[PDB]
Design a protein around this motif. Sequence first.
Motif, PDB file in Angstrom:
ATOM      1  N   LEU A  61       0.982  -1.658  -0.300  1.00 54.31           N
ATOM      2  CA  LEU A  61       0.289   0.359   0.218  1.00 54.31           C
ATOM      3  C   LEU A  61       0.716   1.041  -0.005  1.00 54.31           C
ATOM      4  CD1 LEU A  61      -2.952  -0.956   2.545  1.00 54.31           C
ATOM      5  CD2 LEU A  61      -2.348  -1.716   0.481  1.00 54.31           C
ATOM      6  N   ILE A  62       0.822   2.341  -0.865  1.00 58.70           N
ATOM      7  CA  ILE A  62       1.195   3.682  -1.566  1.00 58.70           C
ATOM      8  C   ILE A  62       0.793   4.566  -0.880  1.00 58.70           C
ATOM      9  CG2 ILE A  62       2.532   2.274  -3.149  1.00 58.70           C
ATOM     10  CD1 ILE A  62       0.712   5.447  -4.137  1.00 58.70           C
ATOM     11  N   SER A  63       2.018   5.275  -0.131  1.00 58.15           N
ATOM     12  CA  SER A  63       0.810   6.757   0.750  1.00 58.15           C
ATOM     13  C   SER A  63       1.103   8.177  -0.577  1.00 58.15           C
ATOM     14  CB  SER A  63       1.708   6.860   1.766  1.00 58.15           C
ATOM     15  OG  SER A  63       1.647   7.790   2.089  1.00 58.15           O
ATOM     16  N   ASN A  64       0.490   8.740  -0.429  1.00 60.48           N
ATOM     17  CA  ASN A  64       0.524   9.894  -1.235  1.00 60.48           C
ATOM     18  C   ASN A  64       0.043   9.509  -2.979  1.00 60.48           C
ATOM     19  OD1 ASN A  64       0.275  13.023  -0.562  1.00 60.48           O
ATOM     20  ND2 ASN A  64       2.458  13.290  -1.678  1.00 60.48           N
ATOM     21  N   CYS A  65      -1.034   8.924  -3.089  1.00 58.68           N
ATOM     22  CA  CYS A  65      -1.448   8.898  -4.342  1.00 58.68           C
ATOM     23  C   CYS A  65      -1.263   9.797  -5.158  1.00 58.68           C
ATOM     24  CB  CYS A  65      -2.054   7.512  -4.442  1.00 58.68           C
ATOM     25  SG  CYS A  65      -1.999   6.287  -6.285  1.00 58.68           S
ATOM     26  N   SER A  66      -1.382  10.812  -4.853  1.00 62.49           N
ATOM     27  CA  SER A  66      -1.349  12.393  -5.367  1.00 62.49           C
ATOM     28  C   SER A  66      -0.161  12.338  -6.318  1.00 62.49           C
ATOM     29  CB  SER A  66      -2.095  13.026  -5.073  1.00 62.49           C
ATOM     30  OG  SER A  66      -3.158  13.302  -4.109  1.00 62.49           O
ATOM     31  N   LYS A  67       0.184  12.187  -6.372  1.00 63.02           N
ATOM     32  CA  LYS A  67       1.983  12.130  -6.990  1.00 63.02           C
ATOM     33  C   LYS A  67       1.900  11.383  -8.047  1.00 63.02           C
ATOM     34  CE  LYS A  67       6.087  13.454  -7.028  1.00 63.02           C
ATOM     35  NZ  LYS A  67       7.082  12.981  -6.773  1.00 63.02           N
ATOM     36  N   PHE A  68       1.267  10.387  -7.965  1.00 66.18           N
ATOM     37  CA  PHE A  68       1.034   9.797  -9.438  1.00 66.18           C
ATOM     38  C   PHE A  68      -0.077  10.150 -10.299  1.00 66.18           C
ATOM     39  CE2 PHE A  68       4.008   7.410  -8.179  1.00 66.18           C
ATOM     40  CZ  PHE A  68       4.516   6.977  -6.285  1.00 66.18           C
ATOM     41  N   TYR A  69      -1.718  10.208  -9.586  1.00 68.59           N
ATOM     42  CA  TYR A  69      -2.571  10.318 -10.188  1.00 68.59           C
ATOM     43  C   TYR A  69      -2.920  11.918 -10.823  1.00 68.59           C
ATOM     44  CZ  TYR A  69      -1.900   5.461 -11.256  1.00 68.59           C
ATOM     45  OH  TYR A  69      -1.379   4.286 -11.686  1.00 68.59           O
ATOM     46  N   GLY A  70      -3.179  12.388  -8.453  1.00 69.94           N
ATOM     47  CA  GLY A  70      -3.524  13.836  -8.861  1.00 69.94           C
ATOM     48  C   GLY A  70      -5.170  13.810  -8.568  1.00 69.94           C
ATOM     49  N   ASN A  71      -6.093  13.992  -9.142  1.00 63.68           N
ATOM     50  CA  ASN A  71      -7.472  13.937  -9.227  1.00 63.68           C
ATOM     51  C   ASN A  71      -8.101  12.988  -9.927  1.00 63.68           C
ATOM     52  OD1 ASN A  71      -6.449  17.858  -9.855  1.00 63.68           O
ATOM     53  ND2 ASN A  71      -7.179  16.545  -8.344  1.00 63.68           N
ATOM     54  N   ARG A  72      -7.572  12.381 -10.669  1.00 62.65           N
ATOM     55  CA  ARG A  72      -8.243  10.737 -10.915  1.00 62.65           C
ATOM     56  C   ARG A  72      -7.933  10.090  -9.996  1.00 62.65           C
ATOM     57  NH1 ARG A  72      -4.367  11.273 -13.540  1.00 62.65           N
ATOM     58  NH2 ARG A  72      -4.190  12.969 -14.399  1.00 62.65           N
ATOM     59  N   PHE A  73      -7.751  10.312  -8.620  1.00 64.49           N
ATOM     60  CA  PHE A  73      -7.222   8.958  -7.501  1.00 64.49           C
ATOM     61  C   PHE A  73      -7.732   9.977  -6.173  1.00 64.49           C
ATOM     62  CE2 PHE A  73      -5.336   8.582  -3.311  1.00 64.49           C
ATOM     63  CZ  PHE A  73      -5.583   7.291  -2.714  1.00 64.49           C
ATOM     64  N   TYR A  74      -9.543   9.282  -5.929  1.00 63.04           N
ATOM     65  CA  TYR A  74     -10.450  10.397  -4.758  1.00 63.04           C
ATOM     66  C   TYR A  74      -9.724   9.473  -3.676  1.00 63.04           C
ATOM     67  CZ  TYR A  74     -12.045  11.820  -9.013  1.00 63.04           C
ATOM     68  OH  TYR A  74     -12.459  12.829  -9.748  1.00 63.04           O
ATOM     69  N   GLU A  75      -8.598   9.578  -2.884  1.00 58.74           N
ATOM     70  CA  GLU A  75      -8.648   8.827  -1.783  1.00 58.74           C
ATOM     71  C   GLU A  75      -9.211   8.759  -0.084  1.00 58.74           C
ATOM     72  OE1 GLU A  75      -6.034  11.565   1.175  1.00 58.74           O
ATOM     73  OE2 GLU A  75      -7.288  13.564   0.811  1.00 58.74           O
ATOM     74  N   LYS A  76     -10.222   9.427  -0.118  1.00 59.75           N
ATOM     75  CA  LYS A  76     -11.604   9.237   0.531  1.00 59.75           C
ATOM     76  C   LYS A  76     -11.849   7.649  -0.060  1.00 59.75           C
ATOM     77  CE  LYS A  76     -16.026   9.773   2.923  1.00 59.75           C
ATOM     78  NZ  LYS A  76     -17.165  10.685   2.860  1.00 59.75           N
ATOM     79  N   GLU A  77     -12.342   7.748  -1.252  1.00 61.67           N
ATOM     80  CA  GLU A  77     -12.977   6.158  -1.536  1.00 61.67           C
ATOM     81  C   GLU A  77     -11.695   5.993  -2.973  1.00 61.67           C
ATOM     82  OE1 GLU A  77     -16.922   7.369  -3.541  1.00 61.67           O
ATOM     83  OE2 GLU A  77     -16.280   9.793  -2.873  1.00 61.67           O
ATOM     84  N   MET A  78     -10.398   5.784  -2.543  1.00 63.64           N
ATOM     85  CA  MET A  78     -10.229   4.414  -3.625  1.00 63.64           C
ATOM     86  C   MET A  78      -8.667   4.422  -2.735  1.00 63.64           C
ATOM     87  SD  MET A  78     -10.306   6.407  -7.215  1.00 63.64           S
ATOM     88  CE  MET A  78     -12.128   6.318  -7.844  1.00 63.64           C
ATOM     89  N   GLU A  79      -7.978   3.381  -3.187  1.00 64.11           N
ATOM     90  CA  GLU A  79      -6.907   3.051  -2.076  1.00 64.11           C
ATOM     91  C   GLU A  79      -5.818   2.274  -3.544  1.00 64.11           C
ATOM     92  OE1 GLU A  79      -4.717   1.879   1.396  1.00 64.11           O
ATOM     93  OE2 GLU A  79      -5.663   3.475   0.311  1.00 64.11           O
ATOM     94  N   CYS A  80      -4.603   3.283  -3.183  1.00 65.68           N
ATOM     95  CA  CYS A  80      -3.187   2.871  -4.571  1.00 65.68           C
ATOM     96  C   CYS A  80      -2.233   1.621  -3.741  1.00 65.68           C
ATOM     97  CB  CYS A  80      -2.427   3.866  -5.263  1.00 65.68           C
ATOM     98  SG  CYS A  80      -3.470   4.767  -5.736  1.00 65.68           S
ATOM     99  N   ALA A  81      -1.955   0.821  -4.438  1.00 67.80           N
ATOM    100  CA  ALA A  81      -1.615  -0.574  -4.123  1.00 67.80           C
ATOM    101  C   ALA A  81      -0.092  -0.627  -5.417  1.00 67.80           C
ATOM    102  CB  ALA A  81      -1.745  -1.886  -4.349  1.00 67.80           C
ATOM    103  N   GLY A  82       0.978  -0.198  -5.175  1.00 71.22           N
ATOM    104  CA  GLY A  82       2.384  -0.025  -5.999  1.00 71.22           C
ATOM    105  C   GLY A  82       2.760  -1.550  -5.593  1.00 71.22           C
ATOM    106  N   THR A  83       2.805  -2.585  -6.968  1.00 73.02           N
ATOM    107  CA  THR A  83       3.167  -3.444  -6.976  1.00 73.02           C
ATOM    108  C   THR A  83       5.009  -3.578  -6.355  1.00 73.02           C
ATOM    109  OG1 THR A  83       2.310  -4.004  -8.891  1.00 73.02           O
ATOM    110  CG2 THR A  83       3.351  -5.682  -8.493  1.00 73.02           C
ATOM    111  N   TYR A  84       5.725  -5.048  -6.043  1.00 71.23           N
ATOM    112  CA  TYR A  84       6.586  -5.025  -5.465  1.00 71.23           C
ATOM    113  C   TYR A  84       7.232  -6.785  -5.719  1.00 71.23           C
ATOM    114  CZ  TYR A  84       6.830  -7.041  -1.022  1.00 71.23           C
ATOM    115  OH  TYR A  84       6.900  -7.805   0.596  1.00 71.23           O
TER     116      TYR A  84
END
Length: 461
Positions: free
Chosen positions: A395-418
């Motif tokens: 799970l990755i933090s501050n996902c605005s850095k990657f998608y900005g306003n296409r990522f709604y932090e309340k309703e969505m979560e970003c998971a970075g692969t490793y």
Amino acid sequence: EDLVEKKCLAKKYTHLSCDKVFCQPWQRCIEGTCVCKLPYQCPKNGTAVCATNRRSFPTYCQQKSLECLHPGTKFLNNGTCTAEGKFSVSLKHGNTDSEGIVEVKLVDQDKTMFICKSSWSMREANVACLDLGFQQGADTQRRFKLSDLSINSTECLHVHCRGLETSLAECTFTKRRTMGYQDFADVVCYTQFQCVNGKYISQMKACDGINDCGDQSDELCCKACQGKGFHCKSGVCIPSQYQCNGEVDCITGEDEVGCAMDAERRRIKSLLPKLSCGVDLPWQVAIKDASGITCGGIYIGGCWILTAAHCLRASKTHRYQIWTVIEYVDRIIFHENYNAGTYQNDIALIEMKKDGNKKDCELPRSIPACVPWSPYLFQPNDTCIVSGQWGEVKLISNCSKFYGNRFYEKEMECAGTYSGGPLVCMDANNVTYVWGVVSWPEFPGVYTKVANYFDWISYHV
Ligand SMILES: *[C@@H]1O[C@H](CO)[C@@H](O)[C@H](O)[C@H]1NC(C)=O
Ligand SMILES: *[C@@H]1O[C@H](CO)[C@@H](O)[C@H](O)[C@H]1NC(C)=O
Ligand SMILES: *[C@@H]1O[C@H](CO)[C@@H](O)[C@H](O)[C@H]1NC(C)=O
Ligand SMILES: *[C@H]1O[C@H](CO)[C@@H](O)[C@H](O)[C@H]1NC(C)=O
Ligand SMILES: *[C@H]1O[C@H](CO)[C@@H](O)[C@H](O)[C@H]1NC(C)=O
Ligand SMILES: *[C@H]1O[C@H](CO)[C@@H](O)[C@H](O)[C@H]1NC(C)=O
Ligand SMILES: [Ca+2]
Ligand SMILES: [Ca+2]
């Protein structure tokens, strides 16, 4: 020092807020907030107690649940009510009505004694003021300094409270052997970091493990604790001695992992019916239609399967089969506010036909995953198992850095692969949580964050 988070403070989480804390056993979680459960819902096994209206209750839960529902009715004594017994606290030798030296009259003991200051904290102070009428607890910045006088006798009462009690009667008292000088517990009750109840305190008291507020405002929004307090991953601080004490305090549960009337409430928890959730991928489901396009469902309980909307509505036939064993799908409920382009609320419930014509939907041998009730259960840099084989995503933090306003932090979560596959995560006690569903190096997978749909889930489940 920047221990406190600011973005929470708008939503003002008190001890009555599920998302950040456990509801007391005489309460039930409903829409993120602790509500009263009726006395006949408490666990039966318990010893009797006494309320200030001289009424007697079989269990301690039942009393506290009546106090919850019916204000005024305080606590008085363990065991049945005596006729003569009556509790009293008072502030004597003081320039004002909201201050002095604390005097306790223990219901049974006709004698009146003072409290010792060597163990006197905000836990007791708040509780004291709270039954004295002042609803904001004790003052933290102000004091009441004495100059001898009435310091003759050796008498004393050590006290300890959890801190959320609605009366000193509920706390535990023990006569101590007083040293000196001087040892007498004073207090200033609050008459006008801000708390949710309206009490101002200094910022040094914020996020240190101690409830200075009375309803836990200064402890629930903490990136890291100040003093000896222990940081829950959920963003809350707890007293160090709350580690390995036989009570899961943090909603995350990490204080009790790796371990080898206050005592009465703990007892009442251990009897509550715990959820049987998240015991390679038993929860994994596959929603196949008669056309031939698959979605990655996740079994949450009974008749219900949870998936992403977009994949389901990709079918023209609108008739599916659940594979893992083959069940049939009776009806499908999509979230009402699904926004196709932005993917907000990309979530849907599948309801199985059950079949058999004699019992219920549940499969003879299938393990449901756990549905998170709080968005603070799992946080950044937590590892989670993505499936659709299975890949360990983080799970990755501050996902605005990657998608900005296409990522709604309340309703969505970003998971970075490793489609609609599960993002399953596990807590320290091996509970499998359905954290997210697959929605849409510098392109981390985006998942509709299920914790933000527990109410919605509940409404149909
Ligand atoms: C308390 O639980 C025990 C089983 O653990 C049961 O035998 C007993 O009946 C219960 N107490 C009451 C008062 O029902
Ligand atoms: C509390 O109350 C019970 C009766 O309900 C009594 O038998 C017991 O001795 C009391 N004290 C403790 C410590 O339980
Ligand atoms: C999780 O599962 C493992 C299986 O090896 C078990 O040993 C362990 O006790 C479980 N976790 C906890 C916190 O008990
Ligand atoms: C007041 O009484 C106490 C206890 O009876 C005894 O120590 C002494 O007579 C007086 N105390 C002082 C400090 O003079
Ligand atoms: C988040 O997890 C990573 C794991 O590699 C580690 O750097 C640390 O625990 C966290 N990151 C930071 C910057 O603190
Ligand atoms: C979030 O974006 C900011 C710049 O807006 C950047 O400083 C930071 O590295 C980002 N955080 C993460 C975890 O990528
Ligand atoms: Ca504090
Ligand atoms: Ca604990």
